[PDB]
Amino acid sequence: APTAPSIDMYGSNNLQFSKIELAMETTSGYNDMVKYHELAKIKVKFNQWSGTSGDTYNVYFDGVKVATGAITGSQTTASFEYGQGGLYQMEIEACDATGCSKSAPVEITIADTDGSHLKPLTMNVDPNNKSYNTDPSIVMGTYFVEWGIYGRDYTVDNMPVDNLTHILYGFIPICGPNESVKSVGGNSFNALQTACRGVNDYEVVIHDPWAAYQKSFPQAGHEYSTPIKGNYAMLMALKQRNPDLKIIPSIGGWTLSDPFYDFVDKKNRDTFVASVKKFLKTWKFYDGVDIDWMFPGGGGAAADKGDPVNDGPAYIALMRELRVMLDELEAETGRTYELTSAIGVGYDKIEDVDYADAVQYMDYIFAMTYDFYGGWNNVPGHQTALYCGSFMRPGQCDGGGVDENGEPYKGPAYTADNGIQLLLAQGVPANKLVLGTAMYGRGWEGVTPDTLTDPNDPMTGTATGKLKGSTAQGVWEDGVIDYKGIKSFMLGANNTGINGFEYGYDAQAEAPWVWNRSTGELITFDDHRSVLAKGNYAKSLGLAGLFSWEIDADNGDILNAMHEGMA
Numbered sequence: 175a176p177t178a179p180s181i182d183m184y185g186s187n188n189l190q191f192s193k194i195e196l197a198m199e200t201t202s203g204y205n206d207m208v209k210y211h212e213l214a215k216i217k218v219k220f221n222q223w224s225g226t227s228g229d230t231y232n233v234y235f236d237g238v239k240v241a242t243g244a245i246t247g248s249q250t251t252a253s254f255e256y257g258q259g260g261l262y263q264m265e266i267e268a269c270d271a272t273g274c275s276k277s278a279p280v281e282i283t284i285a286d287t288d289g290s291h292l293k294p295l296t297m298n299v300d301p302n303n304k305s306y307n308t309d310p311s312i313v314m315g316t317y318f319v320e321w322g323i324y325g326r327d328y329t330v331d332n333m334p335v336d337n338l339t340h341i342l343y344g345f346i347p348i349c350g351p352n353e354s355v356k357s358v359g360g361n362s363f364n365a366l367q368t369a370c371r372g373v374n375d376y377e378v379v380i381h382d383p384w385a386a387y388q389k390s391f392p393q394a395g396h397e398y399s400t401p402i403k404g405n406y407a408m409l410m411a412l413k414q415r416n417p418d419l420k421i422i423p424s425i426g427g428w429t430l431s432d433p434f435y436d437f438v439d440k441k442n443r444d445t446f447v448a449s450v451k452k453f454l455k456t457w458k459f460y461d462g463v464d465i466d467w468m469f470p471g472g473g474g475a476a477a478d479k480g481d482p483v484n485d486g487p488a489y490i491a492l493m494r495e496l497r498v499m500l501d502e503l504e505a506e507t508g509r510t511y512e513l514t515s516a517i518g519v520g521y522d523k524i525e526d527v528d529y530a531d532a533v534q535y536m537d538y539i540f541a542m543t544y545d546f547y548g549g550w551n552n553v554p555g556h557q558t559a560l561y562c563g564s565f566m567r568p569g570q571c572d573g574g575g576v577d578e579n580g581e582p583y584k585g586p587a588y589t590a591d592n593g594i595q596l597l598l599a600q601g602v603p604a605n606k607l608v609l610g611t612a613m614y615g616r617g618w619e620g621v622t623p624d625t626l627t628d629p630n631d632p633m634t635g636t637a638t639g640k641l642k643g644s645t646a647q648g649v650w651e652d653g654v655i656d657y658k659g660i661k662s663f664m665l666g667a668n669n670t671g672i673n674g675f676e677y678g679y680d681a682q683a684e685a686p687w688v689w690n691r692s693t694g695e696l697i698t699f700d701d702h703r704s705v706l707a708k709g710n711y712a713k714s715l716g717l718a719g720l721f722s723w724e725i726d727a728d729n730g731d732i733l734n735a736m737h738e739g740m741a
């Protein structure tokens with residue numbers, strides 16, 4: 175019977191260990207900042223200053239032996255490796271020929287990126303978000319944006335998680351050609367160059383490591399010694415609260431799509447696919463991958479890129495190859511991984527891909543049924559309408575008609591139904607299509623009554639420019655405004671219209687607007703009525719469900735209407 179081991183807390187790093195090393199006080203290349211280990215190196219020191227020390231020690235985690243070795247004096251260091259994250263009751267046992275003596279149990283922490291070491295996240299959700307009993311098989315998705323923690327002041331704990339099945343995290347960049355990033359400003363290109371130092375072209379990185387894993391959030395109990403912080407640690411804690419929730423990294427987006435055009439070369443796809451596998455092993459809270467390429471065939475941020483012959487086949491091959499890779503992860507982990515993509519729904523984007531071929535490898539297509547009209551020009555229209563609006567010309571809807579100059583339309587009008595129908599026409603199953611809802615408006619100014627051909631329809635007018643305003647009103651970029659801003663500053667309590675704005679609805683299109691006759695300010699968006707129509711439409715067609723961009727811009731009204739529409 176030797177003296178029972180006494181744990182040296184200071185010599186054992188306060189029993190805090192981690193499978194991941196993350197730089198917290200510096201910024202450099204991704205591979206320099208992030209180091210993942212399949213096995214955590216555990217080092218525990220114990221003391222036996224009185225009595226006999228014995229010959230042998232045994233280390234137990236919840237009664238199960240994880241280590242053993244020799245005792246050669248009053249003080250002993252137990253060094254071993256362990257690969258499962260979590261919290262364990264550790265006891266250390268000292269043995270000789272006459273018996274064994276155990277230490278009192280103490281908790282050891284082994285951090286991993288599945289959040290297994292973390293307590294479920296405490297939520298701080300706007301109570302305007304209601305509770306629903308929506309069928310869990312129905313997709314209810316949204317995008318959470320990395321940069322939303324700054325000016326937008328929208329954090330992971332703000333998300334109405336119980337009203338979501340899928341959280342898509344925007345955006346993960348790909349190292350390589352990224353000239354489109356420069357349009358963002360705010361030093362975004364430089365930040366990407368820094369992340370990509372020591373990273374091969376066509377491999378993924380984290381754009382903003384401060385937001386991702388460095389920033390200390392007090393609502394998540396982050397402190398100096400916390401091995402993982404930022405959005406990622408909060409998403410890990412969220413997975414602990416909501417284990418059935420799917421959190422998926424979205425690769426690309428409008429400004430980060432440039433590298434995709436080089437996927438015509440399989441070697442570049444190979445590099446990318448391998449990088450994603452590494453990324454999903456490193457960040458275990460993620461449940462698959464979302465590919466947001468805008469767009470195969472061109473028409474995206476980079477005017478000089480797009481290959482209508484080869485992009486579609488590359489996209490299909492990418493999905494096939496990603497699915498093979500995800501199958502490997504499934505075999506290695508016993509988990510189920512999802513493969514998704516957000517796609518343009520303009521006829522001229524859909525036609526460049528055989529989605530029937532692509533979708534056989536995929537769980538969901540997030541149909542981006544918004545941005546049909548906007549401040550990029552001075553032509554008003556419904557940005558996210560289900561159907562063709564009253565403002566449209568004879569035969570414009572189907573595309574068989576003629577425009578103002580007598581020129582034929584080149585394809586069906588930009589509407590949600592036109593896009594969905596085109597996808598179904600390719601042979602895409604309805605139950606893999608997710609319909610897009612807008613949590614923001616697009617807007618113009620100078621659409622004054624004198625510009626209108628139909629005096630009661632501002633969609634028949636002409637603009638002088640983009641909607642302007644302050645970030646207080648949800649205008650983060652000219653021509654774009656948060657739904658919650660529209661509600662607070664244009665709609666008011668009961669859609670009455672405030673501050674010079676009147677409310678209108680196109681029952682043919684299923685699309686709302688607000689219009690200020692004096693300023694000519696006009697905003698197209700989704701509201702309770704239009705979202706109800708989208709939900710009713712989705713269940714009628716047997717679609718997979720609904721998704722939205724972006725949750726920080728909602729006040730609860732849009733996601734509520736999403737659930738009520740699917741009820």
Ligand SMILES: CC(=O)N[C@@H]1[C@@H](O)[C@H](O[C@@H]2O[C@H](CO)[C@@H](O[C@@H]3O[C@H](CO)[C@@H](O[C@@H]4O[C@H](CO)[C@@H](O[C@@H]5O[C@H](CO)[C@@H](O[C@@H]6O[C@H](CO)[C@@H](O)[C@H](O)[C@H]6NC(C)=O)[C@H](O)[C@H]5NC(C)=O)[C@H](O)[C@H]4NC(C)=O)[C@H](O)[C@H]3NC(C)=O)[C@H](O)[C@H]2NC(C)=O)[C@@H](CO)O[C@H]1O
Pocket residue numbers: 321324325326345358360362382426427428429430466467468473474516517518519520523542544545546547548550588614650651654723724
């Ligand atoms: C039918 C048809 O074909 N119509 C065409 C139409 O499609 C075209 O318009 C484009 O449509 C597509 C959809 O098909 C849009 O792309 C998708 O939809 C959403 C919403 O539109 C996209 O969301 C944008 O995402 C970008 C990133 O890609 C966001 O950019 C961010 O901007 C903010 C500033 O607001 C930056 O914040 C700064 O961040 C730094 C830190 O980095 C911080 O320090 C600063 O404080 C902070 N500043 C501020 C002011 O907050 C941020 O860095 C940056 N992020 C990045 C990574 O670049 C942008 O805000 C989002 N816009 C809106 C609106 O929310 C999304 O990319 C994409 N979704 C998916 C799922 O992929 C596309 O946006 C749209 N383009 C345009 C130009 O509007 C049009 C025009 O070509 O043609 C029609 O024919």
